[PDB]
RNA sequence: CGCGACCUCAGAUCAGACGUGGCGACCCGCUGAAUUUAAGCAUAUUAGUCAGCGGAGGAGAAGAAACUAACCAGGAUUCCCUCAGUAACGGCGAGUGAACAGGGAAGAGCCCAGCGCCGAAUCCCCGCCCCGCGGCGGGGCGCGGGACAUGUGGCGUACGG
RNA sequence: UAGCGGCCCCCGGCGCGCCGGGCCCGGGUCUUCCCGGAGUCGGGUUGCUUGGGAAUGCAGCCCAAAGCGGGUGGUAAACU
RNA sequence: AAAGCAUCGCGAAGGCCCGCGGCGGGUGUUGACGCGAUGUGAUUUCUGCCCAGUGCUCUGAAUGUCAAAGUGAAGAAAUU
């Protein structure tokens, strides 16, 4: 589920990623924290790819 | 069936209550048994106080009882730290310790810190070895003064400060108590919607 | 140390590494008997945090329990009552399958004391638990003051009286507004106190 | 109501089969190396009556391939076999009455009996007296064979399924009118407790859906749904049609 | 491979942990001999292998392990499945060898998940 | 081929131990009705009660906050008085129904895993001798055995260390 | 029967009295380091339960965590 | 009841039935000349018309209805 969420975040479907993670992890507050840290690893991957 | 004027009553007697009825015929026997245990414990622990270790002053919570104080479970770690008593040592010398309690205000902390210090002066400490005393109370102090202190140790009493009569000033006569309460309630009730509106106009103007 | 990593790895149960290990283990456990003594704890980290020690007198038993609810065992689904009590399916047991697993291990080994149990795998029909058992008469157990408590007779069949971690979870114990049902020690204790008519001598 | 007669039968009890004097399980020889790659010879030592069964059974003795020991096998007797006759079982056995061959090696139109439903099940199809199966076609690519069963159904089976060449002995048994209730009594006394049969309309409502009435009558359609619960599923279960079957059988 | 592992065990044999009986000999001898002269001689504890996954894991994290050898047949494999990656991250060389029982024989035990060199 | 190590298993009338069954007033874990009330009756009530099953002890269970509160705050559990037939639940019908504060009885606090450091510093069994000595053991010894690095023990646990 | 009545025998805790023995540092200040229990919490849904009422507790199934996090704050939800 | 007659289901991953449960058990040491379910009631001679109703059964290209899960859209989210 963390992989599909990252796929949605990569197409910039942030709303869809949040609605997906909420169904999987449960609460809205747990969903934001998860989505946020998955954004960081995607951002981390972009930096590594650039370098 | 109701008859004429009466109260509508709903007695809670629809279960097998007769099977669970606690009678109190052993109440005199229970009181005797508790008394003998108290006396037996006091003889065993003499000359230590019969009631038990000293308890702190605490203020009862809620608006119904915050005007009264009572005995707490035990002295907080901050109170013992200020008084200079190690938390492990406090139990042996008859001081109750409650690590859960936290001191929100300094008035309560100083009240119990003073209580601990005044207790420490009143304490007579027998040496572990009667022949050899190190830092214990004086032989004379132990020989005569030591006796079992009955009743709570340093009972916690509600102290009321007397306020002498005085001339009423002009300001006090002009103070509107009713309007101060009525406006204070409205200020608290409308504080948020006022912060919203005042903020809302801020970006409206800017 | 190593245990912290094993603890973190076991939290990643849908990772590729752990998905493989759980599946291959669950297949293996499905090929054994319902009650089977394990040579050693499958999860050394989880075992020792639950009370296990690598010393003689501690044993592990793997228990397999069927998953699902509790069908009402009435003949032909007839309950002979009012419609409120006509339910036969969609009924749930009051205790957990982990509690049932401890009860099975405890009943089989009546000479041992159930300490705790932990999950090790599941499939559609079975859940696998590893119960830590202690032999209360081994000298390594009786001569250790930290474990001398389990040797006392009051701790006989803790799993059958709801005193293990898994067992006590179903009792409704706890502190606070939520756990008012069991003020006094148990739901039965609270009910007795609240339904007992206190008739004093002077009324 | 109470539990109806059809529902009591499943509990076993008085409805269990009478197997005291039955001679054994009439089955083919267990498949092994010899009957996979060549053939094995056996001799018919006796042809015996099995109580409750209209078909005779044949005691056939084969040598054991791996141990010095004789193996006795109880076969369904193909009509025409006689005591002292050698019968051969295997892939390389010849097409003779009483021989056992895989249906793959049989030519199309072969008449067989005691045919395996699955490869190695030792014979399940066309075992009653006077019944047989016909080999229709083969599919050498898929290793499959089409057969026609006594009911008229056509079934696709593996070509490794073995069968006995010929028809089951004892045919024509149903031609004789039983005539007497006593002959029917003796017939089922060797089978199971299923006779005589009381009509449901002659019972009371408590014990059959058709019971009751001031006249004897079903009162409800006899045709009943396939999903009807046990205790209700009586009469014509899932009938596609009812009435004198006029013309030919369809599908 | 076979010849490297044989070479690895040849060096690791020189740093096998003292048996309890061997340690007792060392002690009585050290206690009695140092009693005659000056007892206070801590000197240097000689280098020795470090065994156990917990002991090795801390050594890797502190970068105190010069070489880590892990058995390939640890079960459950969770006990060491992180170890090759951890050694790579801290930049300490690690080798997987055949047989936890082979490692256990070094430390006079039945098995051993891993051993580590710190000093030689 | 074989010889070894480990792992996972198995057998024994193997050496030494342990469980079973009873009683069941009170206690713990399950399961669990209907009579009855509702002037009928199905939710409700009876009732988480009777019956059924399992497990204990002289008590049991509970228990040192993932607590209560919203105050100038209290401070493990259990029991009593009160809260209170109340807040609340309810064909909002019949009926049902706690808690917190307050006053008392009693009062007691703690230990691991983890995280680290200490040369496994730890434990069980066996043999011998010396002493208290109905087996309770203390120590000494043994190039005795085993457990144990898939982690024993000392220190340390949210009050910090 | 009464009696801080007598005598005899047995049993147990305490009180001081060599030993068989073991065991033996603590507190404060400062700097630095360390710090936590997962198919669990939580979410959905089902059934039971509760005074707990847009769900008090329990269990099944499915989903399935985090670490300035997590739980609670008696009306569902977002923000603070 | 009965022989006789007729109808119905089923080729075993099956029909019919049992069972709280184990894909446990009966038929079944069985296999359509068999098992299971009904009606009628030996033989003789016949068994007409009705498929509108109610059953049962077949069919599912496709329209009309049709739950949970899922998918979409709006919303801060619940939710719609
Ligand atoms: K009828
Ligand atoms: K749930
Ligand atoms: K069957
Ligand atoms: K019609
Ligand atoms: K019709
Ligand atoms: Mg008191
Ligand atoms: Mg062992
Ligand atoms: Mg009933
Ligand atoms: Mg229950
Ligand atoms: Mg207890
Ligand atoms: Mg307890
Ligand atoms: Mg409670
Ligand atoms: Mg009451
Ligand atoms: Mg009936
Ligand atoms: Mg009969
Ligand atoms: Mg008939
Ligand atoms: Mg009849
Ligand atoms: Mg009649
Ligand atoms: Mg009927
Ligand atoms: Mg008639
Ligand atoms: Mg009729
Ligand atoms: Mg009519
Ligand atoms: Mg023996
Ligand atoms: Mg018993
Ligand atoms: Mg009595
Ligand atoms: Mg009534
Ligand atoms: Mg009446
Ligand atoms: Mg009535
Ligand atoms: Mg109830
Ligand atoms: Mg009862
Ligand atoms: Mg007893
Ligand atoms: Mg008690
Ligand atoms: Mg705590
Ligand atoms: Mg309280
Ligand atoms: Mg009142
Ligand atoms: Mg409710
Ligand atoms: Mg009630
Ligand atoms: Mg209170
Ligand atoms: Mg440790
Ligand atoms: Mg007298
Ligand atoms: Mg918080
Ligand atoms: Mg809030
Ligand atoms: Mg006729
Ligand atoms: Mg008819
Ligand atoms: Mg007609
Ligand atoms: Mg016409």
From Swiss-Prot, chain A:
The lineage of its organism: Eukaryota, Metazoa, Chordata, Craniata, Vertebrata. Belongs to the eukaryotic ribosomal protein eL36 family. Component of the large ribosomal subunit. Component of the large ribosomal subunit. The ribosome is a large ribonucleoprotein complex responsible for the synthesis of proteins in the cell. Transmembrane segments: none annotated. The gene is RPL36. The modification N6-acetyllysine is found at residue 10. This is Large ribosomal subunit protein eL36. It is found in: Cytoplasm, Cytosol; Cytoplasm.
From Swiss-Prot, chain B:
Its main location: cytoplasm. GO terms for cellular component: cytoplasm; cytosol; cytosolic large ribosomal subunit; cytosolic ribosome; endoplasmic reticulum; membrane; nucleolus; nucleus. One of its GO terms (molecular function) is structural constituent of ribosome. InterPro entries: Ribosomal_eL13, Ribosomal_eL13_CS. Keywords: Acetylation, Cytoplasm, Disease variant, Dwarfism, Isopeptide bond, Phosphoprotein, Ribonucleoprotein, Ribosomal protein, Ubl conjugation. It is found in: Cytoplasm. Coiled coil: none annotated. Signal peptide: none annotated. Pfam families: Ribosomal_L13e (PF01294). The modification Phosphoserine is found at residues 51, 76, 105. The modification N6-acetyllysine is found at residues 15, 176. Higher levels of expression in benign breast lesions than in carcinomas. There is a cross-link at residues 122, 144, 173, 176 (Glycyl lysine isopeptide (Lys-Gly) (interchain with G-Cter in SUMO2)). There is a cross-link at residue 173 (Glycyl lysine isopeptide (Lys-Gly) (interchain with G-Cter in SUMO1)). GO terms for biological process: blastocyst development; bone development; cytoplasmic translation; translation. Component of the 60S large ribosomal subunit (LSU). Component of the ribosome, a large ribonucleoprotein complex responsible for the synthesis of proteins in the cell. The small ribosomal subunit (SSU) binds messenger RNAs (mRNAs) and translates the encoded message by selecting cognate aminoacyl-transfer RNA (tRNA) molecules. The large subunit (LSU) contains the ribosomal catalytic site termed the peptidyl transferase center (PTC), which catalyzes the formation of peptide bonds, thereby polymerizing the amino acids delivered by tRNAs into a polypeptide chain. Belongs to the eukaryotic ribosomal protein eL13 family. This is Large ribosomal subunit protein eL13.
Curated annotation (Swiss-Prot), chain C:
One of its GO terms (biological process) is translation. The keyword Lipoprotein applies. One of its GO terms (molecular function) is RNA binding. Its main location: cytoplasm. GO terms for cellular component: cytoplasm; cytosol; cytosolic large ribosomal subunit; cytosolic ribosome; nucleus; ribosome; synapse. The keyword Iron does not apply. InterPro entries: Rbsml_eL15_core_dom_sf, Ribosomal_eL15, Ribosomal_eL15_CS, Ribosomal_uL23/eL15/eS24_sf. The modification Phosphoserine is found at residues 33, 96, 99. Keywords: Cytoplasm, Diamond-Blackfan anemia, Isopeptide bond, Lipoprotein, Myristate, Phosphoprotein, Ribonucleoprotein, Ribosomal protein, Ubl conjugation. There is a cross-link at residue 82 (Glycyl lysine isopeptide (Lys-Gly) (interchain with G-Cter in SUMO2)). Residues 164-185 are annotated as: Disordered. Residues 168-181 have a biased composition (Basic residues). Pfam families: Ribosomal_L15e. It is found in: Cytoplasm. A lipid is attached at residue 1 (N-myristoyl glycine). Belongs to the eukaryotic ribosomal protein eL15 family. It is linked to Diamond-Blackfan anemia 12: A form of Diamond-Blackfan anemia, a congenital non-regenerative hypoplastic anemia that usually presents early in infancy. Diamond-Blackfan anemia is characterized by a moderate to severe macrocytic anemia, erythroblastopenia, and an increased risk of malignancy. 30 to 40% of Diamond-Blackfan anemia patients present with short stature and congenital anomalies, the most frequent being craniofacial (Pierre-Robin syndrome and cleft palate), thumb and urogenital anomalies. Component of the large ribosomal subunit. Interacts with IFIT1 (via TPR repeats 1-4). Component of the large ribosomal subunit. The ribosome is a large ribonucleoprotein complex responsible for the synthesis of proteins in the cell. This is Large ribosomal subunit protein eL15. The gene is RPL15.
UniProtKB/Swiss-Prot annotation, chain E:
It comes from the Eukaryota. Transmembrane segments: none annotated. There is a cross-link at residues 10, 38 (Glycyl lysine isopeptide (Lys-Gly) (interchain with G-Cter in SUMO2)). The modification N6-acetyllysine is found at residue 10. It is found in: Cytoplasm. Component of the large ribosomal subunit. Interacts with CRY1. Interacts with DICER1, AGO2, TARBP2, MOV10 and EIF6; they form a large RNA-induced silencing complex (RISC). Belongs to the eukaryotic ribosomal protein eL8 family. Component of the large ribosomal subunit. The ribosome is a large ribonucleoprotein complex responsible for the synthesis of proteins in the cell. It is linked to Chromosomal recombination involving RPL7A activates the receptor kinase domain of the TRK oncogene. This is Large ribosomal subunit protein eL8. It comes from Homo sapiens. The chain holds residues 88 to 207 of 266 of the full protein.
